[PDB]
Amino acid sequence: SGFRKMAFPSGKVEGCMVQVTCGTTTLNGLWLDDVVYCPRHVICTSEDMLNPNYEDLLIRKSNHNFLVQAGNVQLRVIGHSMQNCVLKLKVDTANPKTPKYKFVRIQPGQTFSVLACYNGSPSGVYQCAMRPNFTIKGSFLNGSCGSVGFNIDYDCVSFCYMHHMELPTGVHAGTDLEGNFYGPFVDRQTAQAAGTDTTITVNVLAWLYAAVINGDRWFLNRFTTTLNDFNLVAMKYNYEPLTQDHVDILGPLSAQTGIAVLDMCASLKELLQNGMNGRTILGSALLEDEFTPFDVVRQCSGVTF
Amino acid sequence: SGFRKMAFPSGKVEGCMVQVTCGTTTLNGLWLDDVVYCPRHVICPNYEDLLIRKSNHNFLVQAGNVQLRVIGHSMQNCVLKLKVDTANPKTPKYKFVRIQPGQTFSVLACYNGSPSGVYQCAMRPNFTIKGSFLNGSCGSVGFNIDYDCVSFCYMHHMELPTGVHAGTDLEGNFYGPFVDRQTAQAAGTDTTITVNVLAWLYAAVINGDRWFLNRFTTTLNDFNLVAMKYNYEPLTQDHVDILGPLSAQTGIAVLDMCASLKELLQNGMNGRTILGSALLEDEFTPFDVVRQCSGVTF
Ligand SMILES: N#CCNC(=O)CN1Cc2ccc(Cl)cc2[C@H](C(=O)Nc2cncc3ccccc23)C1
Ligand SMILES: [Cl-]
């Protein structure tokens, strides 16, 4: 019993964290085999960030301008190349602690663990979701750039995010491990604002099924809804549209609890209308949207209470 | 910016997790040097009588794909200590410490000696933890990290009827009036960790959330009379002293913040949130706030 925001064990990722210094800038790098991956803005000054020409800044650099530190050992850089917004530093030593891994690009609504690092040293781990506006509501300070997001289903680490920047509203933006940004963001200090954020509907529904599995049904009603009627209501509360794919994905949880997806949708409609009336759902007074259908199935018991 | 329930990096603890099987029971063990620590209920009660019948070969210990050979066994309170023939080469620098209610820690939830998740939690005033554990989670451990040293503070033993969890320190002493057996055991009425709510209100101020601040202050006694009424733990002078650094950083005295907390208790949030929460959060200590709003590394 119980339901917590659970992160994956960070050990496999901790063994890959290094410190990258280029001039006066120091940030984090990911050391996998003989390559260190880090944000390309490590080659920038603060002044450069307004309108940086990364190709012009990079051509003026040699291998020995990049200092890479793994614990107390200095790694020797023997090559460098840029792939989108990430710098790839070829080092002379392969990481003996390289886990089995893949680079995966995630979609909004997907969750992942973040190992927040400073000076190549991990300081904390927390669970996140890629928001619909492509930002993450993280906890990052200056020096955290290069910190990574990941999932560890089975024994393989799937790296999905690398931290690049903080936006004016306190939220964060970054890239996949191929250097492609999530969202319409640039690694430039320009007028960049996160688009209006919305609630991840399929995740709130999954969390309502997790509440039913843990023995709570006070929020259920005797009504059902069409998919279109649900979306017309939910759009009024800044909720993401629920698609047929979302309904299909919620299939297993519907069969486990005996509550049809559109009947759970009717219950969500009523919660949006009434609020909780001093009650909580899984210890929360707000509707939780950072647990996917897959996270609920992984954490919760296979037997409904 | 941002404020998340952050756990310590779990790597140093992951390298210590093993699977312990005794008969039909399978649970988790902590392998440090040549000793595996696990809940004594793995032998299940008269624990001296059940243990005397057991031999070393009755205990199967598995570390990854390798079977460890048990060469000795002894009991310390509610913890079984299995002497193995191999020292853990991944043993970190460590201490066994007993925590107080209100203090927080990270939990590496494990099943079959394999870590599956990590989460942060607090020891409640009623000595239970609001964890997320399923059957097979027994032997999962709680810890904190200071520089390079792992301080083990909790080992999971059981789930109570209300869904909350009970366990021991690494010396086998239970937190709370609990026993390791099947009987009528219930968690006592819980209270809110006042010093932690105040720390979280300072974290909100640091992150730019000040709507709850007012021009008023309060005496410690007046605040405590109000706290006793909302099932909040009494705030002591030690708590006020511990909140000293956060008070100097934000310019808001502790009894000034206590006047804000009194108003939030008597009038609610009025449809507003604090750090994305509609409830007053009590599972972040003053030290956790200082650490997360300063970037301390391990
Ligand atoms: N608003 C705002 C923050 N902007 C700055 O104070 C300077 N930053 C400009 C800038 C512009 C673009 C890019 Cl790609 C990178 C950067 C860098 C950046 O965003 N780093 C940071 C990442 N995460 C958390 C942080 C918290 C506090 C301070 C800096 C953080 C430094
Ligand atoms: Cl995805």
Curated annotation (Swiss-Prot), chain A:
Q: What is the effect of changing L205V?
A: In strain: Zeta/P.2
Lineage: superkingdom: Viruses
Swiss-Prot/TrEMBL puts the cross-link Glycyl lysine isopeptide (Lys-Gly) (interchain with G-Cter in ubiquitin) at K5, K90
Q: Give the positions the UniProt entry annotates as the active site.
A: H41 (for 3cl-pro activity), C145 (nucleophile)
Q: How is its activity regulated?
A: Inhibited by pyridone-containing alpha-ketoamides compounds 13a and 13b. In turn, alpha-ketoamide 13b (tert-butyl (1-((S)-1-(((S)-4-(benzylamino)-3,4-dioxo-1-((S)-2-oxopyrrolidin-3-yl)butan-2-yl)amino)-3-cyclopropyl-1-oxopropan-2-yl)-2-oxo-1,2-dihydropyridin-3-yl)carbamate) inhibits SARS-CoV-2 replication in human lung cells. Inhibited ex vivo by michael acceptor inhibitor N3. Inhibited ex vivo by compound 11a and 11b.
Subcellular location field: Host cytoplasm; Host Golgi apparatus; Host nucleus
Catalysed reaction per UniProt?
TSAVLQ-|-SGFRK-NH2 and SGVTFQ-|-GKFKK the two peptides corresponding to the two self-cleavage sites of the SARS 3C-like proteinase are the two most reactive peptide substrates. The enzyme exhibits a strong preference for substrates containing Gln at P1 position and Leu at P2 position
Q: Where is the Peptidase C30 domain?
A: 1-305
Q: Known consequence of changing P132H?
A: In strain: Omicron/BA.1, Omicron/BA.2, Omicron/BA.2.12.1, Omicron/BA.2.75, Omicron/BA.4, Omicron/BA.5, Omicron/BQ.1.1, Omicron/XBB.1.5, Omicron/EG.5.1
- According to the UniProt topology, which residue ranges lie Cytoplasmic? 1-305
The entry describes its oligomerization and partners as: 3CL-PRO exists as monomer and homodimer. Only the homodimer shows catalytic activity. Interacts with host FBXO22; this interaction promotes the proteasomal degradation of nsp5.
* Described function: Cleaves the C-terminus of replicase polyprotein at 11 sites. Recognizes substrates containing the core sequence [ILMVF]-Q-|-[SGACN]. Cleaves and inactivates human TRMT1, preventing tRNA guanine(26)-dimethylation of tRNAs. May cleave human NLRP1 in lung epithelial cells, thereby activating the NLRP1 inflammasome pathway. May cleave human GSDMD, triggering alternative GSDME-mediated epithelial cell death upon activation of the NLRP1 inflammasome, which may enhance the release interleukins 1B, 6, 16 and 18. Also able to bind an ADP-ribose-1''-phosphate (ADRP).
Q: By what name is this protein known?
A: 3C-like proteinase nsp5
Q: Which organism is it from?
A: Severe acute respiratory syndrome coronavirus 2 (2019-nCoV)
Q: What is the lineage of its organism?
A: Viruses, Riboviria, Orthornavirae, Pisuviricota, Pisoniviricetes
Q: Which gene encodes it?
A: rep
Which start and end residues of the full protein are shown?
Answer: 3264 to 3568 of 7096
